[model samples]
Target: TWLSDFPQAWAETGGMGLAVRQAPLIIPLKATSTPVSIKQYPMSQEARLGIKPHIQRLLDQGILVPCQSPWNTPLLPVKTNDYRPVQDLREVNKRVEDIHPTVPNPYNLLSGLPPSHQWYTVLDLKDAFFCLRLHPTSQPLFAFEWRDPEMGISGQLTWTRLPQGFKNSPTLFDEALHRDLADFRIQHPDLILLQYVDDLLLAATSELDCQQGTRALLQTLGNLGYRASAKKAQICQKQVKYLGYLLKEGQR
Candidate 1:
């Protein structure tokens, strides 16, 4: 009955991108010197076509901006599957200072919840990097080149928002999400909620309390320009899979 503000398709596309007006930075990039502009790596037809839609979506969200810059890199695949676009930021990461590891240990995160809270709700955020904006000064450092097959157009695009595959993104987003969710337990004292990067869990002693917590958390996420995964959101349940382990009846 709740968490309807976001559609499942939002996960597939829209949910991943930065808020237009907010260019957030946890800590400014501490580069030893100026950014070193690398030339784009050669791409075959398959690589170019594979990343076209993803690039178009980035443009639509205004996360990507067309620029005539000396800085340029290539859109490489995240893994073996070259279709999923991931920026090759090795050059950037090498130059910029990174934050300490802040993503909580999954086991520690799960164990922190009280045993008395038997009912639980889990929220997994899709494309969490998309919700954070990148600072203007740091934007040029992430510039990359791509050419549309039909348009035969070649241009460099830089990130206006925080691009994934960067070293600091997870920490920045986790801190931001945690700060935004600080008041969840305060607003609903009967329920308990914890945030670890993009994952959220709400727990309570009873079904009604659990549902209330879930709905409230969902509202909070939506307000912050982030949405929960409807398919993965387990509501008012005694048994829940959180992080990695499964819990049932106050036992893991």
Candidate 2:
């Protein structure tokens, strides 16, 4: 039902977004940093099989590719949660130069929302960081060895896009998106859009404005290499959950 309305905004149809307006992210290494290689920790056969499809999907999507790097990190197959694999980027995070925080605190951000703008639309950008491309020169810093003994596939794989778990990914993503949406913000002065990393809230004075604003926001986001989760989107509503708080009548 929604895809027909906002075709470019949904992840299913939009796939991975490559920001046309932003430059590829070049990760800055800390001065005097040296390559660090951490071996993969042992994982159960069941856990390996569980997250195999996840690894496969990343590879199939061209997000992950085979590479050789002096720098390495461990990819943990977690059984305590979903089948999704998690990279232990602690070492890498330490080596990379820190990024200044730009995302506002939730409470402070919400307090700025006026009660007059009741209608709201909330969207969570799907796999948000992956939408931003990582520079090839910085890609190797995120390499993690993947070995599928059963499938005879074993190699070091690095992310072509920004990988989750990196300390700077969220801040980097927030800044990148802020830059990308500069035009949207200026063009739609009647609508108030609050962005906290991947979560977004569009506040409007009326339902009609909310609807139009949401549509324009989605279209602009799609064109700029961002895809909002169709299932998570709350469109043209008087009340919606944004940034973990229930936003209604401009009150949290």
Candidate 3:
């Protein structure tokens, strides 16, 4: 019921994806600046078949694009109830400069909620990193090899959006979401907003206020190119789970 009203920000995981307002995040290179490319590892028949659909879906969404990368990495296709390709970025990660995290601590985030605010709503962003776009020049850094000998398809592919498995993905995604939601406090000062990367929790003194803020928040989220996870959303409740802490009204 939360994101249902917000058509622009929230939709099923198809069609055009959310477009974040922030500038494209770039992955910086280290002092060595050596290019690292690895060959594709061995994969089972099932994994090879499963990866086809996943890759196609990303391509359809413009999340993944073709690349002729100077840097190549081995693709480790993993089976996690579904077929998904995992990037082995170890070699590349070591060559990247350190990026300090801008994300707030979990303790600091929870402490922002006042005691009088009881009703809460948690809006989790699905695949948060995918919401942010990658710089075209930097896309090749995430390039990996994928081949389906049976289908006669073999080539290098890279992510047009930020890909997972990178060392700074969480920090990068967290910072991006923070900016996207920066207006929440200014727009609804009465409602308390707490953020932990992809998970966003808002609390208020009354359920009515919570609903009102949530509606506005959803609209803002839509305006800024974000989609909320419908299943994970906790709307207009006195108690909820947030960041591994069970929260209840009037609790110290």
All candidates: CA RMSD (Å)? 2.9, 1.3, 1.9
Q: What is the full ranking by TM-score, best candidate first? A: 2, 3, 1
Worst 10-residue lDDT window for candidate 3 reads 11-20
lDDT of 2 by residue, 1-252 (tens): 657887888898887777788888899999989999998998888888898899889999999999999999998876656666999999999999987887789988887788889999999999999988899999999999888897898889999998999998889999999999999999999888888999999999999999889889988998887898888789899889887788775667
Runs off by more than 4 Å, candidate 2: 80-82
The C-alpha lDDT values of all candidates are: 0.72, 0.88, 0.81
* TM-score for each of the candidates: 0.87, 0.96, 0.93
After superposition, which runs of candidate 3 have C-alpha atoms over 4 Å from their true positions? 1-3, 13-16
For candidate 3, give the lDDT of residue 200. 89
lDDT of 3 by residue, 1-252 (tens): 544566665656322555557888788899778788787778888888878888888888888888788899887777648877888888888888989887888888777778889999888877778888998988999888878788887888898888888888888888787777777777787888887888889888998998898888877877778777776778888889898888885563
Give Cα distance to truth, residue 239, candidate 1, Å.
1.2
- What clash count goes with each model? 1, 0, 2
The candidate, 1 or 3, that scores higher on TM-score is 3
- Over the stretch 78-154, how does candidate 1's per-residue lDDT look in tens digits? 54565778778887777677678988887777777898888988878877877787766677778888777578797
Better of 1 and 2 by lDDT: 2
